[model samples]
Target: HHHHFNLPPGNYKKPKLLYCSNGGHFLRILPDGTVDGTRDRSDQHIQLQLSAESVGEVYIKSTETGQYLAMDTDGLLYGSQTPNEECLFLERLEENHYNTYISKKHAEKNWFVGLNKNGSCKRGPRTHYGQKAILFLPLPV
Candidate 1:
């Protein structure tokens, strides 16, 4: 599952859904919910570009738990507990976006990828077990 947002001009949008295979690479799902697994090909993935300090938020809400996660372009994650008591982290962006080394190690190469606002889209120099990770983002309200 993936979410879509009508970003302001300059900021890029992340995928609504991310799929991983046993190999390690990641693939992006089209708006119609089809997986385009082509690598380095023009039709393989989606890309968004934004200038620095974009004033918007990426909200990821889990339907199973009614929990919501929010992030800004600077890679900050905030958790909403109840209506208040929320927690914030600066180093936790990698946990959800697969932008960290651990996620790369557990992800298959050439078949899975961690989409980022800024980073290497090419397959990294590693491999691991990423056959079960699925990311679903709901369409922005």
Candidate 2:
């Protein structure tokens, strides 16, 4: 699905805070290196936002299939094909968003991308590589 948001106008702010979420609550790190603890009891209620200016491209690679996919901000999914013979177009989820289909038979690993403090796309650890985990990408606001 395609979605967009306009953030409210505000003065420039530095990213001196870090936040993390457990399935239940969110943990906030104060400037003094202290944690404020959980904020919610349900995973769906937790969210994170930063003052990044832009997000980098998304990349994904499957350990089992040995395939790599890269998507740029223009919404293009380009990657090498299996058997090392040609290239193919994967599915685009939205503007600058994409995903590759992996059959259950070939399912092995999964990866995700998100904006770092510098507003650049950063590769994160694989989620549900061989299991299941929720990956939430909150829209800019």
The TM-scores of all predictions, comma-separated, are 0.23, 0.22
True lDDT of residue 28, candidate 1: 34
How high is the lDDT of residue 47 in model 2?
27
lDDT at residue 130 of model 1 (Cα atoms):
45
Best by the TM-score measure: 1
In candidate 2, what residue range of length 10 has the lowest lDDT sum?
83-92
RMSD to the true structure for each prediction, in A, is 13.8, 15.2
**Cα distance off (Å), candidate 2, residue 37:** 4.0
Give the worst 10-residue stretch by lDDT in candidate 1.
84-93
- After superposition, the stretches of candidate 2 with alpha carbons farther than 4 Å from their true spots are 1-22, 40-49, 57-141
- Evaluate model 1: give its lDDT: 0.27
Q: How close is candidate 2 to the true structure, as a TM-score?
A: 0.22
Candidate 2: C-alpha RMSD after superposition: 15.2
